[PDB]
Amino acid sequence: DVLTVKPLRDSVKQALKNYFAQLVNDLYELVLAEVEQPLLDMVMAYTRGNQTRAALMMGINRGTLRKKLKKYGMN
Amino acid sequence: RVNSDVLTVKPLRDSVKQALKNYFAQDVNDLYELVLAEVEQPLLDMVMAYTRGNQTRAALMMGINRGTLRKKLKKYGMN
Secondary structure, eight states, rough: OOOOOBHHHHHHHHHHHHHHHHHOOHHHHHHHHHHHHHHHHHHHTTTTOOOHHHHHHHHHHHHHHHHHHHHTTTT | OOOOOOOOOBHHHHHHHHHHHHHHHHSSSHHHHHHHHHHHHHHHHHHHHHHTTTTHHHHHHHHHHHHHHHHHHHTTTOO
């Protein structure tokens, strides 16, 4: 509905199609990593690095936000 | 910097950024779930097609157990 570029899921679908053609046991994490890092980047940019505002926007507590940032080496 | 560059549509991450930029341009408190569902649905669809419906194969490719995959499919009425 709100995530378009048309909807995002179509870009994900096409990316997976190209990937499979180029062929694994970490596909979920592989995709999550490619989706979470940019999400964290954008939300942090939007709140100017304010973790509380970012967490609240995403609907997750600050602790989980910081865990994700750390996981991707963004701390 | 980034985990991988095998997902392209021109990295997939760029599409996510564009979708978000365009979203913000349009109060939010569920952005993570919004993005998670928009990405998990197509992933499960494509993985299941690749494994021709074999759930055990899909879970193994995805790196999760049978039950978790089961839970995800149900959530998106794909069960």
